[PDB]
Structure 1
Amino acid sequence: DRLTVVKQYVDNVLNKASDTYHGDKPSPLLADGVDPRTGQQLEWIFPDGRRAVLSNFSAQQNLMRVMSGLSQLSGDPRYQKRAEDIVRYHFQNYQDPSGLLYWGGHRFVDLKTLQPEGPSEKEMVHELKNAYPYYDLMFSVDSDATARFIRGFWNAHVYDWRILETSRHGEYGKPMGALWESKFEQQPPFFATKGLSFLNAGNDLIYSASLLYKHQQDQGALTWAKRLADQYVLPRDAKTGLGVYQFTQALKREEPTDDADTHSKFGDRAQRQFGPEFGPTALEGNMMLKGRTSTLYSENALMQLQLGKDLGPQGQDLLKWTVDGLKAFAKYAYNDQDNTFRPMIANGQDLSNYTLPRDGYYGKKGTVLKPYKAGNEFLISYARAYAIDNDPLLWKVARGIANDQGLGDIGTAPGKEVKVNMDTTNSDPYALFALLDLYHASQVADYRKLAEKIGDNIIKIRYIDGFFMASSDRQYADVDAIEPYALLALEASLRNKPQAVAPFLNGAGFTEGAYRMDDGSARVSTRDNELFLLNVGEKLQPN
């Protein structure tokens, strides 16, 4: 019984990941990572050798959704209560006067001391990158405090409201400015700014302002959410419809002297590395490369498709923008012969097998940009887009990914000549989510039958020592694992209660900074993500 498994899992988390440092007066907070063999909680190692237990609430927002969903489906309210208690504790103790929380890429809470920490010396700042926190839970605990966070977030990360110059970094302690009352003047595409309007950070801005609208009827929030979303649509290539990862370019303040020094003060990094051979269209926002295309055509797409549907009539533009981009990416970049996306520039330039002729932001000289396999995250975005626009082009990508992933043939169209692989060994929670999306929209039983098999594979192969891990060899389990989230979505589907579990938008957290190595040296730009990839006996390698 998959629900029983998820229930035991969460019980395990609340046991092993809990605050064991304050006797019989524990906080409600949780450790992000636990070695499921021993119960050892994952630590950050600072310059002097001091160890902090990593408790980063931005990296627990899938877990929060799992706890709320588990309470909804089981009828046991303890999990919802605990999730509420963690939220409350963060508002009470870890919300600065500007509203910002001590979480995100560069701040967390040490579970041992319950003090906020800051692992990156040059960046004691607020940062959310494709995080998508569970604002619905937050609003239900403390709507004021939630709204203060979202307004504080925009206040800190928008450098210039007139032009929507935005940054991935926001300072703590900023007084509140004009916010939504700011005057706006639309600028032409790729205007030059200091702030790098990366879509990974833009995603969280658009999402949070839309949720503030949803909950508080804040029309200013909605106006700016849609406007910021539109900033990534306006610069799209007029011919191909591809792009964009950002809508600004770095203002050139110095003349560069060295290829490998990629500080943005020397100007747009793509123009430096690709400009000589490709001309003016080589700009960072136009670089349709691995990773960037996930942020654009997965993370942004899921969030915008859900928002677009939520808005009804005034969400039709958002849906159009989103689907149009997914169509463009399919038309130009997808190779159905081997289920790959081509690395490209948004002008339609194929970069497949291109050798970088000089060092730079996108790799060292001699690096080869290769077509890359389309993963299950794209199966979700393509399935969801097809649901609202039944375009054979969108279906082709979904069908190609499912085939490549060992799922069999999802058909020539939904419910037409379907031959799913009931013997699949696939255990990817993303595949489970995607099949449920296909089932939900199409009502074709075969898709859910297949999802059940993936769920079973997840339990058989990933449920290890009471936790979920991508491999039995991994040192640490992440309490934010989405395996149980997919399992809950499946259970919700079978119980005809899809609304019991929060929409999956593929958010996740991270923590980044200097981490002290055994020989005493500082490993700069270390990420918790890297720690979760280590197998038993492995150590972080030179970066």
Structure 2
Amino acid sequence: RLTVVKQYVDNVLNKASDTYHGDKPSPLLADGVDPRTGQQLEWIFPDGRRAVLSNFSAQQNLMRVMSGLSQLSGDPRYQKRAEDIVRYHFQNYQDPSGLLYWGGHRFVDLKTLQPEGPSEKEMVHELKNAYPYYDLMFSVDSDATARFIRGFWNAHVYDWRILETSRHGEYGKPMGALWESKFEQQPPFFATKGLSFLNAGNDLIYSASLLYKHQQDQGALTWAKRLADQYVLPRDAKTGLGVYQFTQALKREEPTDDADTHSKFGDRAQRQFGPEFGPTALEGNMMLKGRTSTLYSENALMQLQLGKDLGPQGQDLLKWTVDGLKAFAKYAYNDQDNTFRPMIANGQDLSNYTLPRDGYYGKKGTVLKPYKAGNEFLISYARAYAIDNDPLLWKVARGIANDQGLGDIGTAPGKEVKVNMDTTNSDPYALFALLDLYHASQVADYRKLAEKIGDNIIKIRYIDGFFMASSDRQYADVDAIEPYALLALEASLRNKPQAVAPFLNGAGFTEGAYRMDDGSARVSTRDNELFLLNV
């Protein structure tokens, strides 16, 4: 499997590289390549100008694959290129504020080597569950990395007193008080005009924690953990469930219209569920599909890993994260059909609940149903189990695996195990989870199963020298996690627990106006959509 990954990365470096500057290329890479033509995936601007999309925030799995490949193979070329790419970004694409030209609304054109902004009214910095490889960055340039992290916090915190964050960060913003800002803890679900989204807080928690890890910065650690704790303090006193957000809308006006869901009318959950469920029916307490993926996977996996790695400095973080996942398993999970039940954090089961009025969560008449636990829950629950072997976390891992065609991992590790060695499962996430189960239990069947998945990944997803989700896909994504999974499998088998970075499920995206072939503008197009297109 190591030879395949080496082949693959060689292929990426051959076909995704800068071919626009003759014999003096930059080290930068295209995000996507059509494996049939070698054509690099382009952003098309309103006038028909074509940029080759180089978004460093959409390449941070590849940086990990590259470093992992070097550690396992002993070939230092891949590690060196990853380092060269970091160095070139600090040299050319880092603002005086410290922010990089990357993320949701900026990238670099590989052709011109100039920064781009595909969304003209949003020339801004955004990171959404990106989880960049700061370990590598600190290794290249510790000071420049620290400047990025301080500038990230400075740009994305609107009000330090109450920790109001923003999804969008302005470039060129002067340094404020930063870690020396005054904080005062507000009560659960205080009413405010702003909104600290969890998928904007995730990258803030992760970055400030890594600045602690590398520079022993007490200010960074304090604020990282304090921000994490904002989604913990308002948790339900009985159930320990929640919360998706920790504020509610400031009500300035009485509503006239169920279907007008503007925040000025007040918390949208209190409007639609409040009459029947009481004052605790609030947006942050709505444990619904998608929202629970953000809370109990996107956030939780990262906090689990941080809690562990922070050691003496992460005990509280880790406690909050494992306690939250345990509560969700206890209250909402159904292992028989592998579903989570829709709920309010106070413990109210909304399964088969008909919405009695229009609102933010659906039109009158909609029946709320249990939803299938996707593999983002498999990786968060298997990671949790690896740190704290609780039967409640096993329950979820077991239920999902069985629903994924993997057989029965047992009533507990090594007990009544009946895994399916003929599985056709080729999911990187399944591979990742099984490795965590193995490392917690030493039960050999779990790793034999992961080997099988790895073999399936190569047989069905290694295509034309790339990794693709389908054989018909137009463009391959150089940030594919298939080789990342294969590497962690190989590092387990070769007895190298330090060679490959624990998985955080980060990813990048690019969002803006994109010109269609007929010349029309498609507003808020994402590279995610481009990668789903077939030939």
Smaller-chain TM-score bracket? over 0.9
Shift of 1:263: 5.1
Deviations for 1:335-376, whole angstroms, at most 9, x for unmatched residues? Answer: 111001122222222233445555554455665543221122
Whole-angstrom distance in 2 between the partners of 1:246 and 1:127: 19
1:198 deviates by: 1.1
Q: Quickly say closer, same or farther: Cα 1:409–1:133, change in 2 above 3 A.
A: same
The TM-score normalised by the length of structure 1 is: 0.94
Q: Which whole-Å CA distance do the structure 1 matches of 2:456 and 2:428 have between them?
A: 10
Displacement after TM superposition at 1:55 (Å): 1.1
- Structure 1 residue 480: Cα displacement: 0.5
Partner-residue secondary structure (3-state), 1:40: coil
SS in 2 for 1:192: strand
Contact 1:45 1:52 in 2 (8 A): yes
Q: Tell me whether 514-523 or 336-345 shows the greater mean CA deviation.
A: 514-523
Q: Deviations over 1:439-475 (max 9, x none)?
A: 1111111111111000000000000111111111222
Residues 19 and 27 in structure 1, CA contact (< 8 A), matched pair in contact too: yes
Residues 138-537 of structure 1: pairs in structure 2 closer than 5 A: 138-253=137-252, 262=261, 264-356=263-355, 360-363=359-362, 368-536=367-535
Task: Quote the offset at 1:4 in angstroms.
Answer: 0.5
**Alignment partners' CA distance in 2, 1:357 and 1:154:** 42
| Structure 2 residue matching 1:515: 3-state secondary structure | strand
**Structure 2: any 5+ residue segments left out of the alignment?**
none
User: What is the SS of the residue equivalent to 1:499?
Assistant: coil
Shift of 1:511: 1.2
Query: 1:197 deviation in Å?
Result: 1.1
User: Number of residue pairs matched?
Assistant: 535
Shift of 1:139: 0.4
Question: Residue 109 of structure 1 contacts residue 115 of structure 1 at CA under 8 Å; is this kept in 2?
Answer: yes
What's the CA shift string for 1:290-321, capped at 9, x where partnerless?
22212211122211112112222332211111
Q: For 1:305 and 1:266, how far apart are their aligned partners in 2? A: 37
CA deviation digits over 1:469-500, x for unaligned, max 9?
A: 11112222111110000000001001100210
Distance (whole Å) between structure 1 residues aligned to residue 111 and residue 259 of structure 2 = 40
Aligned in 2, Cα 1:3/1:323: closer, same or farther, shift over 3 Å? same
Q: Following TM superposition, by how much is the alpha carbon of 1:185 offset from its aligned partner in structure 2, in angstroms?
A: 0.5
Say if 1:305 and 1:418 are closer, same or farther in 2 by CA, change over 3 A: same
| Aligned-pair CA distance for 1:96 | 0.8
* Partners of 1:130 and 1:295 within 8 A in 2: no
> Residues 24 and 458 of structure 1: is their aligned pair in 2 closer, same or farther, counting only changes over 3 Å?
same
C-alpha change, 1:237 and 1:535, in structure 2 (3 Å) is same
Q: Say if 1:268 and 1:20 are closer, same or farther in 2 by CA, change over 3 A.
A: farther
Distance 1:530 1:266, change over 3 A: farther
Q: Residues 97 and 369 of structure 1: is their aligned pair in 2 closer, same or farther, counting only changes over 3 Å?
A: farther
**Contact conserved, 1:353 with 1:370, CA < 8 A, in 2?**
yes
2-structure distance, mates of 1:276, 1:524 = 38
Q: Which moved more, 1:371-380 or 1:129-138?
A: 371-380
Cα contact 2:404–2:425 (8 A) shared by 1: yes
Q: Which runs of 5+ in 1 are unaligned?
A: 537-543
Contact kept, 8 Å, 1:287 with 1:346, in 2: the verdict is yes
SS in structure 1 opposite 2:308?
helix
Q: 1:46, CA displacement in angstroms? A: 2.1
Query: Distance between the aligned counterparts of 1:55 and 1:82, measured in 2?
Result: 15
8 Å contact from structure 1 (residues 56, 108) kept in 2:
yes
Worse-matched range after superposition: 150-159 or 282-291: 282-291
TM-superposition CA deviations, 1:200-224 (whole Å, max 9, x none) = 1111111100000000110000011
Q: Is the 8 A contact 1:343 1:370 kept in 2?
A: yes
Q: Cα distance 1:289–1:39, how it changes in 2: closer, same or farther (>3 A)?
A: farther
Over the matched positions of the two proteins, sequence identity in percent amounts to: 100
Whole-angstrom CA distance in 1 between matches of 2:461 and 2:470:
7
TM-score by length of 2: 0.96
Distance (whole Å) between structure 2 residues aligned to residue 193 and residue 169 of structure 1 = 18
Q: CA RMSD in A?
A: 1.8
Q: Is the 8 A contact 1:165 1:193 kept in 2?
A: no
Cα contact 2:355–2:364 (8 A) shared by 1: yes
Q: 1:265 deviation in Å?
A: 4.9
Q: For 2:366 and 2:123, locate their aligned partners in 1 and report how far apart those are by CA, in whole Å.
A: 33
> Aligned partners of 1:528, 1:124: CA distance in 2, in Å?
17
